[PDB]
C-alpha cells in the first residue's frame, strides 16, 4: 500500500490514519512542483487531477480523495473504531463530517495558500472559514470528538486542516475548544510519528 | 422522511436518489434567504450551516452533506444498486467520485453563482472547471456512468451539477460525452418526476 503524499498537505490525514490503523504502507513523495513521484514517474498517470493524496494498493488499484481513502483505511481494522460500522447511522454521520471538512473547510484554505489569489477572494473565504470554524468549535465544546467520545478519521482529517491555520494567519484562540481538540489529537503517537515522518516536527 | 430543499439547487440530487430508490418522502423547501423552512421554522436550527440539502429520518434524526445523504438513501434499497455494496472496493471508488463532484465541481460552481465575487474570481474557477470537467468527460467517454454500466448516486450528483452549466454559460459542446450523459440521466422517469415535483415544470 503506497501513499502518494506531500509533506504538510492534506495527505497527512490518510497518513495518520495509516499509522493509527497499523497497516503495511510506504510513503511515496510526489513533487507537486514537477508532478513526478519519487521514482520520477509522471504522477498524472496515477492521478490525472495531479493532486494528492492517492492510495495505491499492491495489486495496483488506486483511490483518491482524502475522505474515500481514510474510510478504506479504517475498514481494514474494524477493531480500532476509526469509523462507525458501515450501514450504521454513525457511519453516514462520519461521511457527513468528512465531506464538511473537505468542502466547507479544506477548500476554504486553498485560496489562502495560493499567491495568485486576490485579497478580494482571500478575504471572502476567511470570513466563511470564521463562520465554519465557529460551528466546528461549538461541536467540540459538547464532547471531545466529532462523533462523540470515539475518535474517527474525521477528527484526524479535521486535526490536519486545523494545522494550516497558523500558516495562513488564522487565529484559533477565539475558540478554546478547537485548541483543546488539537492538543488532544496531536497527543496521539500515530499523529506524532506522522509529523516526525513528514519532517514537520523534530 | 423529510428533505429540506430549494428548487434546482444541489438538494435535487438526494431528491432524485429518493425517487430512484422508490422511497417516499416529504419535501420541505427552505428559504435560503431568510433561512426558514416552509413552516417558518428557523432552518439554522436544523442546519447551522444554513444550506440544503438536509435529510431528516422518520426518527427525527437529521443528515447533511449530499454525499452522506445519498449514500444513506442508496443503502436503504440495495436491490436498486444505487451504490456498490459497503465494504466493496467500488463503494470507496463511489465515495471517491462523490467527494470529487462535491469539492472539485460543486464548489467551483458556487462562485459563478455569487455577484459579490471578484470578476477575476470567476475566471480562475472557470478554468478549474474546464480542467476537471475535462477529466469527467474523459471518464464517461468509453463508459455510460462514472462507475461503468450501473448508474449510481454519483451519476445523479454529477447530473444535477452539470445542470448548472447553463445558468453560468459553460457550453458543454467541448464535452459531448457530458451532453450524452446529461441526455441519458435526464430521460429517466425518477429524474423527470423530481423536476416536475420541484416545480421545475
Ligand atoms: N478533493 C481532493 C483535494 C486534494 C488536494 O487539494 N490536494 C492538494 C494538497 S492539500 C494538492 O496536492 N494540490 C495539487 C497541487 O498543489 O499542485 C481531496 O479531498 O483529496
Ligand atoms: N436550478 C438550477 C440549478 C440549481 C442551482 O442553481 N444550484 C446552485 C445554487 S441553488 C449551485 O450551483 N450551488 C453551488 C453552490 O452553492 O456551491 C438550474 O438548473 O437552472
Ligand atoms: N457542502 C454542502 C454544500 C451544500 C450547498 O452549498 N448548498 C447551497 C445550494 S446548492 C446552499 O444552500 N447555499 C446556501 C444559500 O444559497 O443560501 C453539501 O455537500 O451538501
CATH code of the domain containing A167:
1.20.1050.10
Tell the residue number behind the cell numbers 475548544, with chain if given.
A177
The A26-29 sheet, strands edge to edge: A26-29, A2-5, A54-56, A62-64
Is B75 found in the same domain as B108?
Answer: no
Q: What experiment produced this structure?
A: X-ray
Question: A51 alpha carbon to ligand 1 midpoint, in Å?
Answer: 5
Is A69 found in the same domain as A45?
Answer: yes
Question: B164 alpha carbon to ligand 2 midpoint, in Å?
Answer: 6
**Overall residue count recorded for chain B in this entry:** 201
Residues with CB under 6 A from ligand 1: A 6, 9-10, 32, 50-52, 65-66, 102; B 99, 103-104
* B120 with A124: Cβ contact below 8 A: no
Is B4 found in the same domain as B45?
Answer: yes
**Range of A37's domain?**
1-82+189-202
Q: Three-state SS string across B25-39, please?
A: CEEEEEECCCCEECC
Cell of B153: 448516486
Closest-CA residue, ligand 3 atom 14, reads B51
Ligand nearest to the CA of B117: 2
Is B114 found in the same domain as B176?
Answer: yes
Q: What is the DSSP letter of B148?
A: B
Which neighbouring-strand residues pair with A63? Answer: A55
* B68 with A135: Cβ contact below 8 A: no
Cell of B12: 435535487
Is B162 found in the same domain as B87?
Answer: yes
| Backbone discontinuities in chain A, residue before each (C to N > 2.5 A) | none
Is B137 found in the same domain as B199?
Answer: no
Cell of A63: 483511490
Q: Omega before B87 cis (within 30°)?
A: no
Orientation angle between helical segments B189-197 and B12-20, nearest 10 degrees: 130
Non-local CB neighbours of B163 within 8 Å, separated by 6+ positions: B8, B12, B182
Q: Would you call B44 exposed, middle or buried from its count of C-beta atoms within 10 A (0-12, 13-18, 19+)?
A: exposed
Is B195 found in the same domain as B149?
Answer: no
Cell of B138: 474523459
Minimal-distance CA residue of chain A relative to B128: A49
Is B96 found in the same domain as B51?
Answer: no
Q: Three-state SS string across chain A, please?
A: CEEEECCCCCCHHHHHHHHHHCCCCEEEECECCCCECCCCCEHHHCCCCCCCCEEECCCCCEEECHHHHHHHHHCCCCCCCCCCCCCCHHHHHHHHHHHHHHHHHHHHCHHHHCCCCCHHHHHHHHHHHHHHHHHHHHHHHHCCECCECCCCHHHHHHHHHHHHCHHHCCCCCCCHHHHHHHHHHCCCHHHHHHHHHCCCCC
Could you give the CA distance from residue B24 to residue B18 in angstroms, rounded to a whole number? 7
Ligand 3 binding pocket includes A103 (Cβ within 6 Å): yes
Closest-CA residue, ligand 3 atom 9, reads B9
For B183, the 3-state DSSP assignment is helix
Cell of A123: 478575504
Ligand 3 binding pocket includes B32 (Cβ within 6 Å): yes
Is A129 found in the same domain as A201?
Answer: no
Minimal-distance CA residue of chain B relative to A92: B68
CATH of the domain at B30: 3.40.30.10
Q: How many domains does chain A have?
A: 2
Is B178 found in the same domain as B201?
Answer: no
Of the candidates A133, A132, A108, A134, the one whose C-alpha atom is nearest the C-alpha of residue A122 is: A108
Orientation angle between helical segments A153-164 and A176-185, nearest 10 degrees: 120
* A100 with B71: Cβ contact below 8 A: no
Q: Would you call B77 exposed, middle or buried from its count of C-beta atoms within 10 A (0-12, 13-18, 19+)?
A: middle
The B54-56 sheet, strands edge to edge: B36-37, B26-31, B2-5, B54-56, B62-64
Could you give the CA distance from residue A189 to residue A172 in angstroms, rounded to a whole number? 23
* B95 with A65: Cβ contact below 8 A: yes
A31, A173, A193 from A196: Cα distances, Å? 19, 25, 5
Is B180 found in the same domain as B125?
Answer: yes
Is A136 found in the same domain as A89?
Answer: yes
Could you give the CA distance from residue A27 to residue A197 in angstroms, rounded to a whole number? 9
How many angstroms is the resolution?
A: 2.1
Closest-CA residue, ligand 3 atom 15, reads B32
Closest-CA residue, ligand 1 atom 6, reads A51
Ligand 3 binding pocket includes B177 (Cβ within 6 Å): no
Contact A124, B116 (CB under 8 A): yes
Amino acid at each position: 500500500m503506497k501513499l502518494y503524499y506531500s509533506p504538510g498537505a492534506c495527505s497527512l490525514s490518510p497518513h495518520i490514519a495509516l499509522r493509527e490503523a497499523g497497516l503495511n504502507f510506504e510513503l511515496v513523495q510526489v513533487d507537486l512542483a514537477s508532478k513526478k513521484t519519487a521514482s520520477g514517474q509522471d504522477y498524472l498517470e496515477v492521478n490525472p487531477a495531479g493532486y494528492v493524496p492517492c492510495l495505491q494498493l499492491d495489486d495496483g488499484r488506486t483511490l483518491t480523495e482524502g475522505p474515500a481513502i481514510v474510510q478504506y483505511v479504517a475498514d481494514q481494522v474494524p477493531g480500532k473504531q476509526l469509523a462507525p460500522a458501515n450501514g450504521s447511522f454513525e457511519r453516514y454521520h462520519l461521511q457527513q463530517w468528512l465531506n464538511f471538512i473537505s468542502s466547507e473547510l479544506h477548500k476554504s484554505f486553498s485560496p489562502l495558500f495560493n499567491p495568485a489569489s486576490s485579497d478580494e477572494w482571500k478575504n471572502a473565504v476567511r470570513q466563511s472559514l470564521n463562520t465554519r470554524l465557529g460551528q466546528v468549535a461549538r461541536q467540540l465544546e459538547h464532547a471531545p470528538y466529532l462523533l462523540g467520545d470515539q475518535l474517527s478519521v474525521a477528527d484526524i482529517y479535521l486535526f490536519v486542516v486545523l494545522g494550516w491555520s497558523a500558516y495562513v494567519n488564522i487565529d484559533l484562540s477565539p475558540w478554546p475548544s478547537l485548541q483543546a481538540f488539537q492538543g488532544r489529537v496531536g497527543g496521539r503517537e500515530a499523529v506524532q510519528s506522522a509529523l516526525r515522518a513528514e519532517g514537520l516536527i523534530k
